[model samples]
Target chain A: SYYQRSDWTADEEQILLGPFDYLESLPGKNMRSQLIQSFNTWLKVPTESLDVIIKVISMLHTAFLLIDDIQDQSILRRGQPVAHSIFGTAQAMNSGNYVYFLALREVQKLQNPKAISIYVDSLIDLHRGQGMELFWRDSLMCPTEEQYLDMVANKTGGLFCLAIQLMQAEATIQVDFIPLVRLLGIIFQICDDYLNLKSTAYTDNKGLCEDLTEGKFSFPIIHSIRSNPGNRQLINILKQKPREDDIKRYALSYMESTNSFEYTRGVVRKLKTEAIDTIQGLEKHGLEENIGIRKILARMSLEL
Target chain B: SYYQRSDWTADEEQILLGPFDYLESLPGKNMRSQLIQSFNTWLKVPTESLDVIIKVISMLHTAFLLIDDIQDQSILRRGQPVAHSIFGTAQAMNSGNYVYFLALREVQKLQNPKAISIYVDSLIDLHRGQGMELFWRDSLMCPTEEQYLDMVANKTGGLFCLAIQLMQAEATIQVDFIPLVRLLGIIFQICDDYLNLKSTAYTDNKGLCEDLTEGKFSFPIIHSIRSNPGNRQLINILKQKPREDDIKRYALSYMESTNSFEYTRGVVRKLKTEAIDTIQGLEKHGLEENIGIRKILARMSLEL
Candidate 1:
């Protein structure tokens, strides 16, 4: 039998205070959950083992936000200037790394190889997706629907997959949730892509069509680019990155002329239904009865 | 018995191919070694374990260099333009993190929690010291000698301590080499600070007193600030960040007026002596018979 991993997840709890606190001061969700409850309700793992897991997740999320802001060249996040705009790039980069290593450090306490193992693959998957997006943006390499779906799985699916996989590794009989988790990730990415165009939160947290400014090939943008091959002006406008409000408005209309937005909305609705069906399948396997999973599904809900 | 960690050190070796390979192309010592030889002679660990350890250390070291380049705002590294000079800050930062996490994922294969435990503490310690130095530089806050020494312990000493500590934890009966490791770290940092002012290699790697340009409170700079209470021009020149070559030369000469250079050299020599004595103390523990550590200590001896 394998030795039990340590119950000292939060042993070095104080090391995270500086950067974690700084990132937390920002206006976003900071994206944390009490791991103790999740473990207790789903994995039936003891609370003694939850401390570092919660902290690691929080720290990783924070690090991703800082790094993401730099890449996006974001002007605002959660209605304020991005952290790098407030702090210099050097400080923000250092703080981002500090947050990441701090999270990785916490995994050592778990003593379970599976805990570290889960994160290892997840981080690689995370970076792979990030690289794909960044490369496509740089080269104007528009991806087909299938390619975009795969990229979303690597980028968005990897996070929750990590959280679920870590807990499952500790359970006596683990339930494989890759399909469901992958579904959730894709739904989230599509919604996030959709939100970048129309959501008020997108306007407040990140400016409207911020993705377009970066020349990122988001769902609607990629859809518009792909289906309307004759729209030579479209890619050129994306490339030009027009700053004027009127130009930006024209770009939006230009994308709509192809019904890209409606197609994306339909896609989001379709994916959400798929996610709901996946959730129900898990419920048949004892997950439907899980209060924590149900709450998560509710949080997972996204609409146009 | 603990489960044997997977010997999978370089898996996803492809993830490191892009940014990591780019960083490696630049001239650097890169501080890598064949762990197979060292572990066989020292820890007597099998070959499979050493591959991952060596790779991780190299990856981690390379990440630090990449990250350090940005924080230093350095244009050149090892007589060539830095990664950030060619690639944007966004690419450099993303690549740096990719290298770091890739190394971390390797640690999980060690199957020994101690492998990760050593890194977790070492990384936190490393960042804390780095954070402190950056703070002082930004605020132009002068630190006392004692304060500087403590910071050096965290920044410089932490790296060596991590490598030594990881090996020791795996040994059947670990020798207490931490004090010696700590001394080496302090010595390394102090000499590096001094070399920033005097060494050609440093000038090539960074620039002439780049620390001064950044207004960093290095050991000599701090000494100059504190010892010459009447030297307002010294502080003024540092604060203005004068760009003209003559003004930069004059600032150097002015700093010399306070005998800051001599004082810094003396401090370096003193730390080197302390490090030598620490090695002697290890000799008393029968560590002199250990070829691997002996070679490490012998190579660690740096000349001013």
Candidate 2:
């Protein structure tokens, strides 16, 4: 009866979840939870279902972070060593993947027919987004701005959409908040790209110009490279994946010369405006005005 | 309508599935398919349903191999470079995970009431088994023989059970072949552990004592270590994770001195007999005789 023995001991579970637990213990901005809370203002999902959605989204966010750190070869996450650094890549990877399935199991508990399909579709989008990003990084091929936005909508937007879609599935009333959510995801990612190079807080949390170190085709970096294609300096610097502070500083100067950061900030502002308009339009369609969501959008603003 | 664009372009899917496809393209023994075919003699599932099961199982097996290679830091798989080696660990990991969700989507196509729960449970077991295996490797702890078998049942037996369980869920008639399947999984894994050290084919496909390089607590290694609790020689070799052939040869000799290989063979033989007896017992209960399964068992024999 080897297959009949379904007893997964608490001690065993602890070992399996050790890496996930370690990362989850660290302080985070709780952006997903904040978004969920803000959206619940309109969706008004039941308390129990909302709890499940919150837990599932948190598990997924933390799980993806675990893998993302490995993919990025990240040193710090939330002011602590990356989970893969402490737990070893194999364990951290397995733990991240393990939690993914566990989160799916949680989604199933919601007992909504739409829940599993939403889970599958969003996860597929996440991988699709992640896949393209990695392909760009490895192939050294810069995607067009539209392609980047599409990727962000898949990668960053996937989880945000998942959270809202699950809430919509559980809510007594239905509202198509996905358009606003998608816009917000693009804004959030571009803001993150801007902050990675410009924010002191980001430098303290992650390394300076961490995307440059990862050889990533981030929004600002893509803009910098594209703004002056003849200047091989920025692309070469990226190819070096510079670890030295001096090289990173110089790269920042190059982006400054191209005004890539300013361009990125402007794009985020435009998207933010569009997002606010979408929110208002939804409000016009008999939904409540979501002041909380507006505040969240403000919080994501580059000026702040 | 970012979320409305569920259009996962073929090109985008190609990037995501690149690593998986790379690994799947390499030739290898189709043991799972063979097992599934052997089991179908009794299960008699419809052709359409069986095709879905086959595709799902193959996807899962290949997907796990991608992650396993990364976890083991493997150099070769099926006489070719591992997917992670060529594709990069992040991409490989992402591809493996992407296929997992895709497989889940395929399972939904089965539309059986029990299909999804079986999928989730088996995947959970697979991770649980892999989790403990990694924990033991990282911690330098040697689990008891019983514990090792339990892990194998979960890790190796998981998919076997999953395939059969899904078959039963779709079959017009039900049979409890799980106990037999579980025994076969243990036999299969133990045989693999034994061959990993002693077989030339395995050495060519993997490497000479690849498990030694992986610091794996394989069946024979576990036996050798436990057989001589006072000796630190073999455990020290494992701790170093020896890559040099001389050191690996030395470790193999130590296991030989401890009669570890002989002990492993005996245990495998004993388990094989029990499995055969179980098959006959099932036959006595009116199931048709399955020579195909017996032939599959014979193929897994150590004497081969």
Candidate 3:
């Protein structure tokens, strides 16, 4: 029988500390619930065991989303002020740490050391990821896919990998799941970058190729550079923080038209398939009962 | 005999990471160590049993310190930039979360459910501590010793109390040590405040009358303000940024003329005596041999 997934919803706990004034009472907890659910879905998180996901973890991730939106200069995040805008910088900053403590507080509740180890590994991954981002923010570079994947695994995949391992850390799951979880995280991050460019009409959070304009070096753009080797001149244009225009538009069009999407889609599909294959290997590990992990991932699968 | 205390000497594993030519290398780790040590000392932590002082626990404390220094604008720590300063606000901000995973990572080592519960309680205490610091940051009044103690206990002592209990957690030792350790923390914070106001020549980290200048609302300043009611008129002077002829002079004059030094000395001595008394109670629980806590604390007790 499959393990039961967490039915607990993220709520009331999100902004319980913030005043109930009109500005403070917006659906932050709700935003948290939504984000948590979305991540769980994308990761195929199992149902029976995922309930251990702490309200505080959800809260911290929500808070990160708020700050990230601010840093990313995002607008209309689940139709809210993204913690910082609502609480103002100081309170928002305070809230960020509060969220972090909440996550730690939640993790300490777990009964397993293996899961804790995995989570610790994830935390280090997060730092490495952030460090690489800082390295890049200081100077843009044309890195190979392997290098880019390493960054993605650290920044985005680290937690994603942790989420999966943590759900069944109490059990002896697949040993190689670490890399599989990382692959899943990378796939999700690439999809996110793609959607940031393609899904502008569907969500306020995703604006038109804003990451590209912001000089974010993601897979699609990185591949575009390699495939269109003669398009070296376009690097200057991308660096200019260009106004969205026909050339820039045509450039993206040309890259996509060159089957960049198909090639990358194949790459992601292969990773996702590998993830499932790795999970299958754990059939003997008794974690299939811990189906919440896959449930988390299904939600992140863009094609689905 | 009491169980063995975890090693207090710096971890050599750090050497593998290598000494950072840059800052933020060890601040979080260093802060975590200090926090755990301070808490353990205040809790009358035995020389041996480190029930909750796990690698994971230290990591969690490190995360909070990363965020705390930023809020306090503690620019130079352990001879380096605050994590936020080194990593940029965005990444430095995330560093706090990364360091915290260690605390959660340590929780797996907890042998009993009670220890787990105490760890959770401390987590809330830490969050509340952050809130209290923020709340007091803007306030001008020097809270009475009672009020200041409560604040200090919540912010610093709570962690100490929590850390001390971690050692006693698996045992059936009397919980009275909890309150005793907390009291030590309150006293330590007061001493720390004094270090800034008086011993600039000795302490590598002390900023002058920083609590007064930054409107930190610490201890000795509260007592001095109360002892000299006439100085109430000077409240306006202290209220400003404490530049030059105003708060700085008042700080020097207050510590010099008043019995602030002697008074604080008496308080600290009393507190330390009480700490020893509390440790003695552990003997009834067969904790007579554990004295490492005392050795570490003896150093902290020195007024250099």
Candidate 4:
């Protein structure tokens, strides 16, 4: 039986257990549940419906994280060794894929067919977003701010869009929250990109510039590169594969010289304010404001 | 842009395209579509519905093959290098997963919500089967024949069950093909296992003792292991992994002497007869006979 883990030999258990254990160590906002619940409550779905939504989103979230770690070649997540580090790549890969179908099973059990379609849509968007990110890193392609924002809209916002869309399918007055939710996703991503360089909150968790080591063409990095078109040295440093802090030193110094951090910081703040205003517009236009979205907005700012 | 592979950056396109190119080289029977079509024809599904079902099953079949190659540690597939060998493991992993959701998106696009639920059920069963196979290998636990049969029912039979089940859900005459399909899967797996050791057809495709190199507990291996309960040396050699030709020679010789191959071959024949008889019973009850099943059974036997 697939659930027959108790009978699994020690090696098999370790291979399967390592990822979920790593998942436990990481601290997440459970943002999917918060928003899902807000929408569920606002739509007045039964308590039983809430559990399925929770389980489905949580499983999808973790599944993406497992594969994303592999894509990013990440060593540490939230200060603990990533699952791949412990279980080996093949196990992590298979197990991550395993969890996704498991989530699909839950969607089958749901009474609403709409949720099933929504889940499929979100997952496709999520992977496409991820593929774009991996491409940028591998090819060392620097995406403009517009391209970066669009990718985030697909990758980061996919889940949030899925969660709200499922409830919207059943609601009496379907609120047009997609644009608002997408705005939130972009703000969160830009904020994350900005914080990767400057946030002590980020440093306290990741120990150094995490994005830099990943050779990610993040918001600040893109801004810095575009701002100093003639800074061939900065481009060379990035191309060197900035896995080490020292290899990243020149890029950091160049960003400072060009005030790229200031530019990104302003971009993040503008996106955030725009998202908040969108929510305010929703509330202003006779839509009942759910505390879940409000709390998410404020909680996100806490880190930002 | 999940469907927008054409627009993918060169690196992204290569990552996505590599496995699909490898897929073209494999000489599969396209059994999923064949079976899905047979069942669909019996059920009288719309022509438009036929396209979605075909696309979904095709994608799912290819996706599993990609991951199965990785799981089996296969180097050559259908006389060509495996995708991971050329594209690298991470790309293969992500791309394989990408295809799954792509399939799911097709499922979502289907007009019938019933097919959506059916897809979810089949995919879950497929992964559970996969998980069981991986567990058996990693655990190195000698499974009883009953346990072995059950695992194949999940892993190999799952897709067949799924293909037929979806059409069965909509059929005018809903016959329980699951048991028959499952029986066929077990026979097919056992025959493949037996052929791996003795048949040139198997060997010519995958080299000498490929399963043994993978250290897979195939039907013969499990039978020999179970029969020689006290054969300490044989157990020790298997534990060391019977990769070298000589080590595998001893394992093969032991199976021959103990009639382990004969036992598995006998079992395969019995199951094949039972499947044919079951279909004959359906024919006796006024069900129109489709030659597809007969051809599949005969085609499978030809390879065996």
Candidates, DockQ = 0.25, 0.60, 0.17, 0.26
lDDT of 3 by residue, A1-304 (tens): 0111121123413433552232234544242234345444434545544566645345545655655554444444555445545554445566555565556556655656465456567666665665555455435567677667777777787666666566546444335455555666776787776665566442454445666555666777777777777767545555665556555576567668667667777776777777677666665665444465565556566642
Task: Count residue pairs with overlapping backbones in model 3.
Answer: 44
CAPRI band for model 3: incorrect
Tens digits of per-residue lDDT for model 3 on B1-304?
Answer: 0111122123322321111213434533243355455445434554444535745555555566666665665555554455556555555555555455545556655545565567667766666655655555544555666656666776777677766667666445454566666766766677777776777542245245555555566566666777888756435555665645355766667656767767777777877777777667765665445466576456565772
Among residues 3 or more apart in sequence or in different chains, the pairs in candidate 1 whose N, CA or C atoms overlap within 3 Å are A78-A205, A283-A288
On the 0 to 100 scale, the lDDT of residue A260 in model 1 is 89
Candidate 2 per-residue C-alpha lDDT over A83-147 given as tens digits, one digit per residue, 9 for 90 to 100? 98989998999999999999989999998888999999999889989999999888888888788
Per-residue lDDT over B136-230 for candidate 1, one digit per residue giving the tens place of the 0 to 100 score: 66556687777777767877777777766766666665667677667766766777777777777777777787777766777787888888777
Could you give candidate 4's per-residue lDDT for residues A33-63 as a string of tens digits?
Answer: 7767655545676667667777877887887
Relative to the unseen true structure, what is the C-alpha lDDT of residue A139 in candidate 4, on a scale of 0 to 100? 66
Q: Model 4 in CAPRI terms: which quality?
A: acceptable
Task: Tell me how far the alpha carbon of residue A43 in candidate 1 is from the true structure, in angstroms, after superposition.
Answer: 4.4
TM-scores of the candidates are: 0.86, 0.98, 0.66, 0.85
The candidate 3 chain B region of ten consecutive residues with least summed lDDT is B1-10
Cα error, candidate 4, residue B140 (Å) = 2.9
Q: Between the candidate structures 2 and 3, which one is better when assessed by lDDT?
A: 2
**Can you rank all candidates by DockQ, best first?**
2, 4, 1, 3
